[PDB]
């Protein structure tokens, strides 16, 4: 089937992202590799690379067509959820929040975790853009998605996102502790190439 190779592609991308191995993700685009991606996956790969290197933006036509195709589908499955969650930083926020709100109104074990990640990404993006009425809703939905589920990775990144939201809105000394506890959880479990991504963010937040 088709949705069996897309999962392997996403897992390969996320494993090369953890090792910080650029130039191996930037080799699926070139016309010599195993994975040949349809123009909706090339856009997702370019959007993922854009987070590691700010000069690999997708074109405006690609994003226009991706948003047009997203606003048309009605059965949101394993494909559209990933395409949207991995392009939160390029698609305009106004159209990201609408789709994330519609996804949380369509209420499996592998799909709850794939919706939790999209919700957390939308929450981080909404904290960046300073939309605070759109953040309480996301926090209230996410803390109900993570209810009695043993997803410690999503729970850790959501702890960090909650600390971020609390430091942004009120500038209080109680979001700092949540961010530092998330960093502690990353440091105890031995995630060395993942603790750095959050330590750099914390350092550029607190120091200005």
């Amino acid at each position: 089937t088709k949705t069996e190779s897309f999962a392997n592609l996403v897992q390969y991308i996320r494993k090369q992202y953890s090792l910080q191995n650029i130039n191996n993700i930037q080799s699926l685009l070139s016309d010599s590799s195993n994975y040949t991606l349809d123009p909706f996956e090339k856009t997702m790969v370019k959007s993922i690379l854009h987070t590691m290197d700010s000069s690999i933006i997708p074109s405006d036509d690609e994003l226009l067509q991706l948003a047009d195709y997203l606003f048309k589908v009605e059965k949101w499955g394993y494909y559209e959820i990933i395409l949207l969650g991995n392009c939160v930083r390029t698609i305009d926020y106004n159209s990201v929040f609408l789709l994330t709100k519609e996804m949380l109104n369509n209420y499996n074990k592998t799909n709850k975790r794939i919706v939790t990640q999209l919700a957390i990404n939308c929450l981080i993006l909404s904290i960046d853009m300073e939309e605070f009425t759109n953040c309480f809703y996301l926090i209230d939905e996410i803390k109900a998605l993570l209810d009695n589920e043993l997803n410690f990775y999503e729970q850790t990144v959501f702890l960090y996102a909650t600390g971020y939201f609390e430091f942004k809105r009120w500038q209080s000394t109680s979001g700092i502790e949540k961010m530092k506890q998330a960093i502690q959880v990353l440091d105890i479990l031995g995630e060395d190439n993942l603790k750095l991504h959050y330590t750099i963010h914390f350092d550029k937040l607190i120091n200005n």
Binding site: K15, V88, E154, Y198
Partner: peptide, 8 residues
């Protein structure tokens, strides 16, 4: 960045 790669 601090966003998680959805799907992996």
């Amino acid at each position: 960045d601090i966003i998680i790669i959805v799907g992996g």
